[PDB]
């Protein structure tokens, strides 16, 4: 190819060592996430990997609250995830200060996409290996899922999955969305959407999950909130007592 | 001292029909003593004529600046500078210097190379654009000039008769000054010949 690790030159391949390996290394934390949109809600469910009893089970996070509406899941190594989180938080507030309007998903995606492209262009900064799944129920764009991947490429999605078991999850979402003939969930109450999500997740990843194995972030019109341990339990409980 | 009426000056522009006219004085003073009957205030850039009134230092500095801007524009574009365009560039150069000195009243006259129609526009030190196709006047005696022009002008004039309106408007406006004596010139502009005619008039 080229020799991208010693000088910032191109490859005739079009894709460089920095880009190619950023595509790979985004999973080593043994993580899987999915995001689905309801009719009028957006739900994220993500694996939560508390591997020890030396750690508090609720300081381990991978879902960050970037704004008051906007949520961002970072799929990547934790230093890179926080590097992205810090920058995203400033850009979100700075955009509200100057332009008088809180941040939507797509504009945050764009800012970061441009940054990641520049650090690949530079020979004086490294780019990060982060896939950023931005989610909300935007005021004008409706329910939203916009996912960025490393490269500085980003695009809008129906629904999405991340992790080595992306493929397993995909076949379940596809099957539902064809059946219903729409690209969102017919349901419209964030509880029933969360419950549905978990169902398709158990099925794909092949293990029944506990509350400490999940971490839930919910987006609704004009608010973002995270669901606690008790809150996750209430959903789980029904899936265990029906066939 | 005075901020611009050291040397004074007046400028008048009319529209005719395929034609425009721009006229000005030729006074240079040092306070109230008129020193010379000659000092040109009218220059042109491509085919758009720029008369600038005010302080002599500020006409000179602007004239060299507008040479600089017209030339690089001309070079990139392989094409001359157009009345319509020129109005905007003058505004934009003047608003930057509203915080600087400037005590000028330029008047622009031309015929477009892109719809064949007469064009005049007026500027102050403030940079209020005056959009006009009848006449536009600037300078120390601009108030009077507005009264003379509003009464005397009649629409759709050919170079000889247009000439007579402007020449007399300027002469009688000037007669109630001393800061508008020491000779005066009229240029009557067609897009194919320019006739330059010196008038005979008062001085102190």
């Amino acid at each position: 190819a080229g020799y991208d690790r010693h000088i910032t030159i191109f490859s005739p391949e079009g894709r460089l060592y920095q880009v190619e390996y950023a595509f790979k290394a985004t999973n080593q934390t043994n993580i899987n996430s999915l995001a689905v949109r309801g009719k009028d809600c957006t739900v994220v469910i993500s694996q939560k990997k508390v591997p020890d009893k030396l750690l508090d089970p609720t300081t381990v996070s991978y879902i960050f609250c970037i704004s008051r509406t906007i949520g961002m899941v970072v799929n990547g190594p934790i230093p890179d995830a926080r590097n992205a989180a810090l920058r995203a938080k400033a850009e979100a507030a700075e955009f509200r200060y100057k332009y008088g309007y809180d941040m939507p998903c797509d504009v945050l995606a764009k800012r970061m996409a441009n940054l990641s492209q520049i650090y690949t262009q530079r020979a004086y900064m490294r780019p990060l290996g982060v896939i950023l799944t931005f989610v909300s129920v935007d005021e004008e764009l409706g329910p939203s899922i916009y996912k960025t991947d490393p490269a500085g490429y980003y695009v809008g999605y129906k629904a999405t999955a991340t992790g080595p078991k992306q493929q397993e999850i995909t076949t379940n979402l596809e099957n539902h969305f064809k059946k219903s003939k729409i690209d969102h969930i017919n349901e419209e109450s964030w509880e029933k959407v969360v419950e549905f999500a978990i169902t398709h997740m158990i099925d794909a990843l092949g293990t029944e999950f506990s509350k400490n194995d999940l971490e839930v972030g919910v987006a609704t019109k004009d608010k973002f909130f995270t669901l606690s341990a008790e809150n996750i339990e209430e959903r789980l409980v029904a899936i265990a007592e029906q066939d | 001292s005075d901020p611009s009426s050291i040397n004074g000056g007046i400028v008048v522009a009319m529209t005719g029909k395929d034609c425009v006219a721009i006229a000005c004085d030729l006074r240079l003073g040092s306070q109230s003593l008129g020193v010379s009957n000659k000092f040109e205030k009218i220059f042109h850039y491509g085919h758009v004529f720029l008369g600038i009134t005010g302080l002599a230092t500020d006409v000179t500095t602007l004239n060299e600046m507008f040479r600089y801007k017209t030339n690089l524009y001309k070079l990139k574009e392989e094409r001359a500078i157009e009345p319509e365009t020129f109005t905007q560039l003058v505004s934009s150069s003047l608003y930057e210097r509203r915080f600087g000195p400037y005590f000028v009243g330029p008047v622009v006259a031309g015929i477009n190379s892109k719809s064949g129609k007469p064009f005049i526009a007026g500027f102050d030190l403030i940079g209020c654009i005056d959009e006009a196709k009848d006449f536009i006047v600037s300078g120390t005696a601009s108030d009077q000039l507005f009264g003379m022009c509003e009464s005397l002008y009649e629409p759709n004039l050919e170079p000889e008769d247009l000439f007579e309106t402007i020449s007399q408007a300027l002469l009688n406006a000037a007669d109630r000054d001393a800061l508008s004596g020491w000779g005066a010139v009229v240029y009557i502009i067609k897009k194919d010949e320019v006739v330059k005619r010196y008038l005979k008039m008062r001085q102190d």
């Binding site: 979100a92 507030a93 700075e94 509200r96 200060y97 | -």
Partner: protein, 205 residues
């Protein structure tokens, strides 16, 4: 140099009650003697449970407040939810370094669920002062006696609602740069509740 200058309704308050704080204001901008605004939003959210009353010069208060808004958004996302005292300092810093151009009379009042309701009053020149309730502007001296005597902690919401409507409606009458709507903001943990009452209403009530 600002040409002309602007002024606000100058009788502002934050009152503590049973479950938090209820924040109360009159609103009116004038530019000289031209009534620039009948109604105004000068009931300003600086965070979701921490609002403020802005008084003093319209141009200046709004310009400051926007900056405070940027710091407290960034502050939330990173360092966790603010406190009333956190908001108050940021407001003060901006007034003090630029008290050469700024005239801001601020009550910041916010609700926390381990401090209960909190009132921090930052006068002109800027200094943070914690009080259990506040009245500010220049019309406040005249209601000092009322306010002190009928101020009571843990009073019923209905009773506090009357008390603020009444407190201002008296203040507005005797003072002259006061006028326009009375707007009020209830801050408890259930969220933020918005009250507006027009002139013809409050005078009467």
């Amino acid at each position: 140099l600002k040409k002309g200058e602007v002024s606000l309704g100058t009788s502002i308050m934050a009152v503590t009650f049973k479950d938090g704080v209820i924040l109360g204001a009159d609103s009116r901008t004038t530019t000289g003697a031209y009534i620039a605004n009948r109604v105004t939003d000068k009931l300003t959210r600086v965070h979701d449970k921490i609002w403020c009353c802005r008084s003093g010069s319209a141009a200046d208060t709004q310009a400051i407040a926007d900056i405070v808004q940027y710091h407290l958004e960034l502050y939330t996302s990173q360092y966790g939810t603010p406190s009333t005292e956190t908001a108050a300092s940021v407001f003060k810093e901006l007034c003090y370094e630029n008290k050469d151009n700024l005239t801001a009379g601020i009550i910041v009042a916010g609700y926390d669920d381990k401090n209960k309701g909190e009132v921090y009053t930052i006068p002109l020149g800027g200094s943070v002062h914690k009080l259990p309730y506040a009245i500010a502007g220049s019309g406040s001296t005249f209601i000092y006696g009322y306010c002190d005597k009928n101020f009571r902690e843990n009073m019923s919401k209905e009773e506090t609602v009357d008390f603020i409507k009444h407190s201002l409606s008296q203040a507005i009458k005797w003072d002259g740069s006061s006028g326009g709507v009375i707007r009020m903001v209830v801050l408890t943990a259930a969220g933020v509740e918005r009250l507006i009452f027009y002139p013809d209403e409050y005078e009467q009530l």
